[PDB]
Amino acid sequence: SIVIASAARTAVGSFNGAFANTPAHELGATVISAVLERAGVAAGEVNEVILGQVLPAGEGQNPARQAAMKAGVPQEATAWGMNQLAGSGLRAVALGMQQIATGDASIIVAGGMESMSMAPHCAHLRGGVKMGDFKMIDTMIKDGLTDAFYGYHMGTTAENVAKQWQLSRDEQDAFAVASQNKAEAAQKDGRFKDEIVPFIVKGRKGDITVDADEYIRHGATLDSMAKLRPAFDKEGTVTAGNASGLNDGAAAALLMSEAEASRRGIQPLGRIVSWATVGVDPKVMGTGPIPASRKALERAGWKIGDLDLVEANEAFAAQACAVNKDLGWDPSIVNVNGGAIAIGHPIGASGARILNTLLFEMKRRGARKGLATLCIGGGMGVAMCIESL
Amino acid sequence: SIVIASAARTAVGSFNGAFANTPAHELGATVISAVLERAGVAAGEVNEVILGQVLPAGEGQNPARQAAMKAGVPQEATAWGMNQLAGSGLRAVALGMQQIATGDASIIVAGGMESMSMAPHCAHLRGGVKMGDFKMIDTMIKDGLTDAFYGYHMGTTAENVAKQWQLSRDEQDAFAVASQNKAEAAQKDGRFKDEIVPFIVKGRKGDITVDADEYIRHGATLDSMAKLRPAFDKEGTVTAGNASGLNDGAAAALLMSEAEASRRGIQPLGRIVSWATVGVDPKVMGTGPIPASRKALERAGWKIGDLDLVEANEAFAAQACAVNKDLGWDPSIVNVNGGAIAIGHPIGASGARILNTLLFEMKRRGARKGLATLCIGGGMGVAMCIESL
Amino acid sequence: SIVIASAARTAVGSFNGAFANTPAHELGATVISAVLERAGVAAGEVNEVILGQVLPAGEGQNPARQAAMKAGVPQEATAWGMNQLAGSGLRAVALGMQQIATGDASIIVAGGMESMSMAPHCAHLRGGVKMGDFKMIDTMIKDGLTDAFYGYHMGTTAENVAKQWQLSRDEQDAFAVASQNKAEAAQKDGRFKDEIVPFIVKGRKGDITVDADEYIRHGATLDSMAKLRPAFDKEGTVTAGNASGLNDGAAAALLMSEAEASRRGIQPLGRIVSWATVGVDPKVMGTGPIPASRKALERAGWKIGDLDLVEANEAFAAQACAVNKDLGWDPSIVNVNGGAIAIGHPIGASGARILNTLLFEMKRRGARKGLATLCIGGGMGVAMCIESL
Amino acid sequence: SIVIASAARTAVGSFNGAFANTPAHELGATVISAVLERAGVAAGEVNEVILGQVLPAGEGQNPARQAAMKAGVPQEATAWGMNQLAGSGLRAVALGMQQIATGDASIIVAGGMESMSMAPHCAHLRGGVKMGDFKMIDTMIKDGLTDAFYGYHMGTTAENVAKQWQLSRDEQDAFAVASQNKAEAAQKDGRFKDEIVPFIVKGRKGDITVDADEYIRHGATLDSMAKLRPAFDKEGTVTAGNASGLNDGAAAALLMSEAEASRRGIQPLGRIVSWATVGVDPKVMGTGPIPASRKALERAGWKIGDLDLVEANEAFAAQACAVNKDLGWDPSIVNVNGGAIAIGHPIGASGARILNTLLFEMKRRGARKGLATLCIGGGMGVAMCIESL
């Protein structure tokens, strides 16, 4: 019915790294441009651009429209942003599918983008501070990483899952080190080459082309993982090593109907067979993928064992281990090229980021059935089922 | 197929007025609670809440979810926010409809919420300011009201439309005054009573219940409109009097299928027969409703003359006049109870706000066919067609 | 040897009151102009302007020079600012005296100015805040009212003196009320008329002439004083009522040698017979005046009983009582026209402010010997002995 | 009469370099401790500390007292800061000399300190910003480097002096290069070793001892100088190369009477024979040293040809050349060990900084008569004559 014709992502940048001063929409325009090129679709044929973005403060009116216009998508098209936290990037794709499914659009570019680096500090000053000190608020932490109900960082929700599922520091570290090793191997063997489009960081004393995931550490040791101090609980288990990072990037997919791709002679990256989103307790939001993946599979008519490949986002080693444990899918088909502990976690973009990695690995090993899933702050999960054509 | 079972909205607050220190999600919870109570639907039955919001900076993770959970919608449900600027509140509804149409939900609460009063000032300070002054940026102006492609206020786009359509200061002021006069008459006659749910502003030296639109001026004279200076062009035509204001409010609709409503014994407020969104030049974005409405009616199979009632959002008198002039619908069926010049423009809520006004007027006078439309910053428009059951 | 030929001050403004948006140098220029006029001395004859100022942040290069130049003091003369906190205003006069005594200058305009209202908030941001919230620092608190060695407000140092000297809440309130009643009586009787020069607050919809001390409250009851909550210690004795306020204002004196005034036919306000400055424990800085006055009286060769009039700055009721109690001078000859609890406490200007009060009262009642003294943050005191000619 | 018993300074740190995060008073406390040690005077014996500081915003109450107390000067001594911009450090010494000459003190530590790196950005926010963007004001530029009468940088005042004195780009560059070469030669020859006391920059992953001037560039070519673009006038002559920098540091001298050094068996670095300060046009403030030095020499009863050594502060190549040209002293005896273009310009400290350089060179070559002078923003200059014993 609805297919993914082409996809593309920027490299994921380190916090205040390669893309430290690059607005999100600049990354999404590059990505929008890339999916057009890959599909053989002209920007004039695009009906709407949908881009997940959790932290747009300061970047001006509707950055999704800014991206679309910059990529040369005509003014006649539309664009909008949405926010389901780390779910955003993938949810945008499901949302883009529904446009075509209900007959309101034919061609949709959908994904996510995020510049955690460029997120500003803020304060509400309209009423005026009569007297005393006031906080300038880091919008990345406030609006991206803090739970609104319990007031703690997502890492504390990772601790909740760890205790509940009795996951040791050592077990979380092994998972972490493994993510790094798989991603380093993938990177060196060229397996991110297909999915990555280069990004030119414009300069004044020179332009810089970034075409590699810079957050991936080389020769990651178990020792140096075990040496780290707990990051959120001074007698806790979750660390800066076994948690994902703060990162920048964008990622997208071009969607159309299966019959339309056939007319164009496009050979799609996959067909979207189903998706699902479900809520869980905020305190254990890392478990979101469990009901969300089960639901998606149920909608697809698939057994857990039918999946040949899986991308389950690594917000924290604690949560990823829990999800794998409960769902019980073959861990060897999961995050085959590493995950967000190594690659990075650009919130609004990660859902589309991990879709890209799924799609291109599926194609390269000739996998038929895949699933992509992410946990989401405030207690949600999202999943999507993809089949090869 | 898809019906609006119930709807509700807060009063619209004046900038730094009654809701000066009320977070947007607090207004959306009230609104969510009200649509549930009006439809005879319990919170536990809601699958997902979808709330438009352009300015959530500083408010924490996913305000849509905060709204939902405060209304007692269970943690198993999902929630997300979205931004198509002024289109957001109505687009959220069309997006809710599609969840049910594609069979992914049964019961959606959709609309918009906005606290322009509580929007913070900000600055990107990670790299640091080595030397020299920097700007603290008002996010309301930056992310709400400024065009990203030309750098000027929406008021300027309103200037652009006035010149293109040769609309005098005097004609714009006549419209402005009429809007106020219709809105005051409606207010005093009690015509907003049906659609408004009261909001309790919590206190410390006293709670305050707000159930009237406080931005509406009483005894608005033409004289006092004509005495105002131009706001965006010191030799211009647009003024604070003939533009919409800066405001606070939330508004929503509870969606389900027509067959579901029937099972429940609900008499819906209307059936969504169609919606549309289309792009126009950023410089003349006020003209967005023209193609968007024409498309929506084409999709509904309706003639312009088939509409019995119309809500066309008054972002500025210049654009509203241009929209009416081009579409040529009977201006006496348009904004019958007044519009945003009088009522106010809480950006991300406005589209569900004017849906509410359409729906309760349609019901009270027995109108069969209605249409709602808004212009959108950066050159877009959105429209939705509604028919009574 | 060295005489005060003339003197003048602005009225003392309330915090964010009449001088809410008035830079300090503007107040200082008015005061400079006033002392010239009163002495019959042309600006061109001035050698140097010395102005005390604790909170010049944001106002631009050397506000003392700005004040001098705007008062039409020629570009040949010199000007500088200096900081000994609350002792700055009176210290400037002593420093100006030394300029003439060492033979480096003939004519000096010395005093102090302060705009606590215009003091900005700040943050060091060159390094750049990589991540997390940061504080914007109210420089009035940080640089004006916080102890550098123990990190607490000057009201804590008043709490220290209160416990040490066993001064009750009731005793401090009796002193506070008395200061208000003496100041209101003086004001209505026109005893501040001679010292005050009016300041014109430039406006856009109208100019405003301020020539009365606005911080003096009329009909100050003991009841309303006793109803106030402790300000710095939630089981303490110091309050907003029995402490001085945050205030704006400027004050100065014109200095020359005794023989110079005689040549010019000027009848001076007083001769500077001596001065002194001494340190005490930071924790009990309010006690500064004790050693500083005893030193000054030793240098002047005076007994404490020789003083006919005294101005002992009321930073806090607790400290002012302690100073009076130790020194044991007649409390009826101290702060005859009230003090800073009623009049206000513009840190940099206060020293010269109370000098003016001392001088014009000395003249009107014909007092021969006078003394002015102030406690200084960080544990210091300053005093000056004056004799009429 | 009054002698400089000892002297010391920190190295001068580059902008955001070695002292990037070091509060000024910390550098002052080191310099206070140094001069005590060198003179063989105990901290207990000091009466008062005088420290010039132009940019103390954010550092708390009276940093002069913070320095004195950290250096172990007892709470019975007094301490204050002053501001005559670049003239402050040397003026402090003069002011300290007068304390002893007027009999109010015996032993004074006087000089200057500045952390231009630690100067914060600020904004007046009491009134509160109703709407729109507002500037965060860099207090370094605003209070340090901007003219309060004409509103342009000090580099523009240098442009005025250049045009006025017809000083070419090539002449200014030849002076700049020479300053860098003389300083580098002096550095390698160990001529700054005597005056410099090391500063320990406290750390967390290690302490760092700074004891060399880091702003001095090695191998300064005329080519690289001439390649630079104009800094303040896009068709101008002043550059970052031929102007002094933005720096951090501190410097002081211990003052006592001549007979007091003789009692103590101290051989002073010099006797302060005279000082002087005079104003000029703000537009051409760089000419300040001219009248100020001519006045000082007239007070000292010296001819310009009697001077054996001179320190004339190099704020800008343009002004320095003009001063040298007018006064016509032998340029080979001026800034023998280089100047501020090479060594750096920590505004408040420079006046005490160059005093040190003057003194320790006078001792090492056996010069009898010496002079120090600095231009001062807003059109002033200061100068002091020193004679060896």
Ligand SMILES: CC(C)(COP(=O)(O)OP(=O)(O)OC[C@H]1O[C@@H](n2cnc3c(N)ncnc32)[C@H](O)[C@@H]1OP(=O)(O)O)[C@@H](O)C(=O)NCCC(=O)NCCS
């Ligand atoms: C955990 C977190 C707070 C850490 O932030 P941080 O302290 O600034 O990160 P840093 O890398 O600077 O600090 C960790 C230290 O451990 C080291 N480190 C990090 N990963 C390591 C690894 N895998 N092996 C060895 N050392 C490692 C770093 O080098 C650093 O030390 P250094 O500064 O000397 O180099 C942050 O990454 C985070 O909040 N991530 C979670 C995001 C999230 O919640 N996502 C949303 C959920 S869907």
Ligand SMILES: CC(C)(COP(=O)(O)OP(=O)(O)OC[C@H]1O[C@@H](n2cnc3c(N)ncnc32)[C@H](O)[C@@H]1OP(=O)(O)O)[C@@H](O)C(=O)NCCC(=O)NCCS
């Ligand atoms: C126009 C706008 C900038 C307000 O500017 P402002 O001058 O700062 O606001 P004010 O209300 O104070 O305007 C000035 C005066 O107009 C007066 N005024 C406004 N409406 C009036 C009325 N109809 N009758 C008489 N006077 C009126 C106000 O009372 C005010 O009086 P004052 O000067 O004594 O305070 C703001 O309302 C706006 O930009 N809204 C546009 C909405 C928008 O861009 N929406 C997005 C597009 S979809």
Ligand SMILES: CC(C)(COP(=O)(O)OP(=O)(O)OC[C@H]1O[C@@H](n2cnc3c(N)ncnc32)[C@H](O)[C@@H]1OP(=O)(O)O)[C@@H](O)C(=O)NCCC(=O)NCCS
């Ligand atoms: C103590 C301090 C925080 C109080 O300032 P503030 O809280 O902004 O003052 P407020 O207006 O909020 O005072 C609260 C109330 O107390 C009342 N109050 C204060 N002084 C009063 C008095 N003299 N008599 C009766 N009522 C009084 C006010 O009317 C006010 O009423 P409101 O809250 O309804 O407006 C402030 O003045 C301070 O830091 N003191 C400076 C003392 C000082 O150190 N001076 C320099 C020497 S080192």
Ligand SMILES: CC(C)(COP(=O)(O)OP(=O)(O)OC[C@H]1O[C@@H](n2cnc3c(N)ncnc32)[C@H](O)[C@@H]1OP(=O)(O)O)[C@@H](O)C(=O)NCCC(=O)NCCS
């Ligand atoms: C002129 C001034 C504004 C320059 O500030 P700046 O723009 O930050 O200058 P920079 O340090 O960035 O210089 C730019 C580059 O030129 C080079 N350059 C500067 N001076 C040079 C010189 N002396 N020789 C060779 N190259 C030089 C530097 O290597 C620097 O390299 P970068 O690319 O890594 O930055 C600053 O020095 C200033 O405000 N002057 C102080 C004078 C003043 O007003 N103080 C009080 C006077 S009374």
